Point group: D2
Chain length 249, copies 4
Amino acid sequence: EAPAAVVTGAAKRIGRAIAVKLHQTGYRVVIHYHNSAEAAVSLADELNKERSNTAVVCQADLTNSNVLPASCEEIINSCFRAFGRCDVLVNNASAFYPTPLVGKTVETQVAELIGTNAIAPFLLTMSFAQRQSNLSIVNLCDAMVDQPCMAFSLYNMGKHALVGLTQSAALELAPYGIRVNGVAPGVSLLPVAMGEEEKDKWRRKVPLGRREASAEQIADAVIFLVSGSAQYITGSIIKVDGGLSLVHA
Amino acid sequence: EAPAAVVTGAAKRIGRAIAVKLHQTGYRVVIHYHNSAEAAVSLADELNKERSNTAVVCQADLTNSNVLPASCEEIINSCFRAFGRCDVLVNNASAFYPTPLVGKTVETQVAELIGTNAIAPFLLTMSFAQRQKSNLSIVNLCDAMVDQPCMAFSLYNMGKHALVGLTQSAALELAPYGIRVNGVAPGVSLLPVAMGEEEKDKWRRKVPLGRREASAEQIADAVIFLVSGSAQYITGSIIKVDGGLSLVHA
Amino acid sequence: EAPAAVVTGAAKRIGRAIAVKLHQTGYRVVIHYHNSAEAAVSLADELNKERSNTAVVCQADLTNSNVLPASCEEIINSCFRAFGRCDVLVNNASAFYPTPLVKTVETQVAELIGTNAIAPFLLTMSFAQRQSNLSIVNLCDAMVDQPCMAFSLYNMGKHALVGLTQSAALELAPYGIRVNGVAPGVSLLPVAMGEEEKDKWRRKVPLGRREASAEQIADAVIFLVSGSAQYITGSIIKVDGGLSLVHA
Amino acid sequence: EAPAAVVTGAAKRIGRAIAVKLHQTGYRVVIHYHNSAEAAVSLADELNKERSNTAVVCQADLTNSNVLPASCEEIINSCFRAFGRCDVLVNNASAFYPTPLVQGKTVETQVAELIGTNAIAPFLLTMSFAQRQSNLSIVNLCDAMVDQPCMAFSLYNMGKHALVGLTQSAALELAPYGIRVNGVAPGVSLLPVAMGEEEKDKWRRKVPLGRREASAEQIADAVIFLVSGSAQYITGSIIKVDGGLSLVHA
Ligand SMILES: NC(=O)C1=CN([C@@H]2O[C@H](COP(=O)(O)OP(=O)(O)OC[C@H]3O[C@@H](n4cnc5c(N)ncnc54)[C@H](OP(=O)(O)O)[C@@H]3O)[C@@H](O)[C@H]2O)C=CC1
Ligand SMILES: NC(=O)C1=CN([C@@H]2O[C@H](COP(=O)(O)OP(=O)(O)OC[C@H]3O[C@@H](n4cnc5c(N)ncnc54)[C@H](OP(=O)(O)O)[C@@H]3O)[C@@H](O)[C@H]2O)C=CC1
Ligand SMILES: NC(=O)C1=CN([C@@H]2O[C@H](COP(=O)(O)OP(=O)(O)OC[C@H]3O[C@@H](n4cnc5c(N)ncnc54)[C@H](OP(=O)(O)O)[C@@H]3O)[C@@H](O)[C@H]2O)C=CC1
Ligand SMILES: NC(=O)C1=CN([C@@H]2O[C@H](COP(=O)(O)OP(=O)(O)OC[C@H]3O[C@@H](n4cnc5c(N)ncnc54)[C@H](OP(=O)(O)O)[C@@H]3O)[C@@H](O)[C@H]2O)C=CC1
Ligand SMILES: COc1ccc2c(c1)N1C(=NC(N)=NC1(C)C)N2
Ligand SMILES: COc1ccc2c(c1)N1C(=NC(N)=NC1(C)C)N2
Ligand SMILES: COc1ccc2c(c1)N1C(=NC(N)=NC1(C)C)N2
């Protein structure tokens, strides 16, 4: 049988490109989504049209709460229900917005930003490992976490925690043959709600080509990490940032 | 008048040594505690014998919940109510125990390890900065071994990495207000008193510099430096106080 | 027609695996050697038999000296001469031995800083000067921050190479030249070291209690040079099976 | 008696500030210099006038060459000759200039000066200080911006990265001897004498904490901390003193 992968937040943008690319490599895919039901189901349709019965969707809020462990278990369970196995987990879903230190409550900001970026990854990792060829997890990190955006403390804390998870799970799961690695974009597909001038400000900072990464360029590093060419790599985070993190103020 | 500092988890061990050294330096202190009321009050009584009206206690759970923000606001408020100002915040309180990937529920483990080590620090930092109305700083107790973690301590390790991110993010964001934000990262310091000496020795033997753990006071010394006038240009820095432990390969 | 790569210290071990894998991916290659002529020629023969006139050999000492500049120019030149282009430079060659704080010291600097850092820097200069998917790959070390006792100079050289990786990535990005690193933990162990000492290292590795093969190291090199890494520069990929995550 | 320190490149700027602060703390000092003979002697004159027979000068080129080991040995010997002991080594001297990759001095000279002053001389001086052997320590002057370097400064960047490696490797290997090895990493401190005010202000405006460069004294304060008994458990640590500069994205 073909191996199977879960990609969180896979209806759009980078998560979609990862799902597409995994599928093109031979994987059956679980397309996790939160709000993007139309685009989720649309992507599965496209993949299934190419090879029947190779894509399912699975809906879940990855906000932190007392029921997040059950939702994460359910995402993994979905892969086993549809495909009888789960070889690859891609932790891609992410909330991203400012939380200044000085209309959501602070408790909601914490639950969303830390839940999606860190807690849900951890719980999905636990469920993935409990339910267990070439098994591996890839976490979508952030190349700029040590030169953060102003007023993004909770997002930055989340992505730092995700680095911690990447290392800790790599150490602990290596005895089970499960590798755990990260891919750290710099600027890739820029937000929908961002203006053109602000987009171009960011592009101009990238040494390699003065432009953002394509979604596909990020996916390429994910593909490498899950491949048979990365069988001795665990606990590594690959920056895919065109040099951006090298540039001083 | 005299500056004031809040120290979380200050009843015992490292937090205690930090509160004492701040007080000896001339600070009035809030001693935050969770369970150790008797130790907290004993310390407050000792410090107040040294100088009257210079130390208060403040009880709070720092586990993540819907009431954590209000708790953190109250902790900061307690310093203002007692001393009329809050110059220094030391994020010291920390939960620490294994959370294997493969008798608390997992959601409890999350709330306690991420709440104490990361979220409560964030919410304390927010309340600290919001309430500012000379030499303001925050010091976060980090962990020098976070890139070489103990097996099965993922949630602990996640919380302490998050604390690094908070240190950096808040240093950048609070710099325009003149508030510095730094960390101190112990390697092996005070081990649990009930841990067998033969187990304590396994750790001590790994430390290059003197084959011994840091005392609480040695950790406090770095905190004192960071809050001092000798560190007025330092922000976003994390000082390892680890006797070279983090340099030793497997 | 086909792209061309220089690999330093390519006659044996990791550099040979890198050369072969590059060849099999369809590069023409320059096999650089210092002492290992026989091995270099043997490799070139094996490759040429596969695809005619696609591998050449190049001698140079990479010890630092007043002639290192010219040596490095020569290595790059020989690629332009054999193949009319030079698409990839792999800085693999390297010296390794203890230099206790408590060979003259200056020979040790020239070997340990020269081969590990200064020659990569001079080769990088000649590579860029003489300029598609152009990239440079430097062989770093995953254990730089938890170093072996009494290996100061070696560790200095490998830290310098990290610095070169970053600095050259920034400076050459304008020319579309990518600059990246691959950092082995324990791979092929030194021929010299005890078999008992070897197993002591194997046992520390989380992923499989074993060293990386040379080919696993090359696999990462191949990724970085490929079209699949066209946005990657200034990145160092550890290939260490988790070794650097293990505490004392 | 009083302890003694060697400070390299101590005639002016940050190195003088370190030698001055060490002297005020009660150290005897060797003022190493290369070209700045007048300024070095002037400083030793000031310090001797404060306390007689507490300061000497010592000339040496720290460019790499076959005699650099002897020059480094002689620097350390000068301290023992003058004061009968050597307790602290501060590796401060540094060459700094562009070395573009795509393109005065021959490249071989650039390598000698930039790698020699920033890394090889620190290594040889460390070797001599340890071999020649309380509170012994070495403090290396590093650079907070080594991971976000200036364009066209490969060789300088290489040398400062090697100096981090030295700090770590030496801390590990010398810990059994009770010698601590740490670093201080400025971001922008005293700007070059040659830089125009306009360009200086461009750098100043990037610093979060105050939009100004560090004073030489602020850099010295962190050095003083690392050598002090307040840092007795610290080895292998590099303290950034950069007002948050390294946290600022492009
Ligand atoms: N794009 C870039 O430049 C950079 C991206 N990255 C990282 O790469 C990854 C992919 O980036 P990108 O595609 O831009 O990400 P997006 O910002 O587009 O978010 C990805 C998906 O996350 C899902 N998500 C958000 N909140 C929740 C929630 N509460 N519960 C469940 N799912 C949720 C959304 O699902 P739905 O739409 O179904 O609601 C969304 O489509 C992320 O981890 C990001 O942090 C890092 C650095 C730079
Ligand atoms: N000791 C060491 O070797 C090392 C320590 N560190 C860090 O240094 C700091 C101090 O270390 P140490 O003194 O050993 O810490 P402890 O493990 O002794 O914990 C300090 C205090 O944290 C408080 N705390 C625990 N859980 C909670 C909670 N849910 N709510 C509120 N407070 C809570 C406790 O207060 P109470 O007693 O009142 O309940 C406790 O006394 C910590 O941040 C730790 O992670 C880092 C690396 C190593
Ligand atoms: N193997 C491992 O476990 C690890 C490897 N690495 C790095 O990986 C790379 C490859 O490692 P490995 O294959 O073990 O390396 P080796 O130690 O086998 O050296 C590789 C080649 O370097 C060449 N070389 C040595 N000194 C000189 C010199 N003065 N002038 C010119 N060439 C010279 C030699 O070529 P010749 O034979 O022609 O004389 C030699 O075959 C190195 O950069 C190394 O530091 C890093 C960490 C661990
Ligand atoms: N100032 C800043 O903004 C920053 C400084 N730093 C580091 O802090 C330290 C102090 O900086 P700063 O005071 O500006 O340093 P300077 O640039 O002023 O140089 C210090 C001394 O280095 C000596 N020196 C230079 N070349 C040689 C050589 N070949 N042999 C021997 N000595 C030599 C010179 O001594 P002489 O005059 O006697 O010839 C000079 O006075 C340095 O290590 C530097 O790299 C790091 C980042 C920023
Ligand atoms: C300012 O450019 C960035 C910079 C960093 C980014 C980022 C965008 N993203 C990040 N995560 C998520 N989830 N979405 C977006 C908003 C696209 N990280
Ligand atoms: C195994 O020795 C360590 C190693 C790391 C430690 C640690 C103890 N501690 C940590 N945090 C907290 N809160 N308490 C204790 C148990 C003292 N980190
Ligand atoms: C441009 O600001 C910097 C930034 C980094 C600097 C630096 C100056 N210096 C450095 N080293 C030496 N030796 N002198 C000077 C030129 C003052 N590092």
